Ligand code: HEM
């Protein structure tokens with residue numbers, strides 16, 4: 700249940716998400732591409748889903764990958780801005796869930812983004828505490844897939 | 845090209861876009877839904893394209909419409925944030941262009957959004973100069989359609 704999942708975002712979790720987002724959200728292009736390049740490197744079996752982006756190994760030099768990556772960060776920005784209102788958070792989460800259901804992405808495979816996020820956070824000196832908070836937000840999307 | 849259309853956005857135009865967005869972008873849920881409802885009210889022929897959203901006459905109460913509307917405002921947020929780097933603006937514009945090309949939305953039809961934006965701007969007392977500035981931004985996306 701996406702609603703029960705959203706309820707897991709307690710005061711402490713929301714604070715950790717906001718505090719860490721202030722840092723990682725400041726460079727959407729850089730951290731967005733970093734997150735994607737990590738996903739492709741750690742889970743090569745997911746590259747097939749991104750055929751439209753072309754040669755993803757090119758990283759920042761790939762215009763389609765850069766456009767996709769920046770936009771992905773705005774989806775996260777959207778989630779963060781809706782933390783105050785559960786009903787709005789859920790409707791935006793379900794919107795993005797549809798974008799992935801149509802691409803045949805399961806909850807299990809969507810969860811593969813946790814590794815990349817933990818690594819991007821770690822590179823900014825944000826440890827497991829923050830990685831776990833972000834896993835709870837990702838879990839809300841997983842509940843809708 | 846799209847790059848040409850973006851590279852032409854002048855300092856004055858960018859100033860007007862940023863000043864007006866400071867206001868209309870501060871209430872994404874409210875202004876996003878208002879923009880969509882106005883599109884359906886003045887251009888009823890577009891309603892069919894949004895069948896996935898269900899009964900759009902439900903307005904704010906329609907969770908699918910609300911989720912879509914909030915997300916549309918973040919696409920605009922994305923554009924505004926990329927104004928000083930045409931290369932990044934172009935790659936995000938092309939990304940959203942694909943979302944519409946796949947739905948068979950022509951450049952002419954995409955331009956139907958200008959009416960709603962003009963009315964939303966007007967509700968906050970931003971006149972013709974501002975509407976013209978936004979039409980130029982919309983024209984960048986049209987260059988990709
Ligand atoms: C924090 C997690 C993630 C977020 C917020 C997110 C967000 C997005 C957004 C905003 C889009 C563009 C939607 C569209 O225009 O159709 C997208 C596309 C896509 N996502 Fe994700 N995504 C995430 C994780 C994943 C993961 C882990 C996978 C795969 C294992 C995945 C697979 C896809 C695919 C295949 C596309 C289509 C790309 C294209 O052809 O343009 N996403 N995602």
Ligand code: HEM
Pocket residue numbers: 798890893894895896897912915916919920940943944947949953954955956957982
């Ligand atoms: C300021 C201009 C506009 C922006 C920034 C914009 C942005 C968006 C975004 C972000 C999406 C979601 C893409 C996806 O998840 O697949 C979308 C979907 C869509 N847009 Fe637009 N759009 C604009 C104008 C228009 C206009 C004028 C039309 C029609 C005449 C249009 C038709 C569509 C359709 C049919 C969808 C698919 C809705 C669905 O089934 O979820 N858009 N748009």
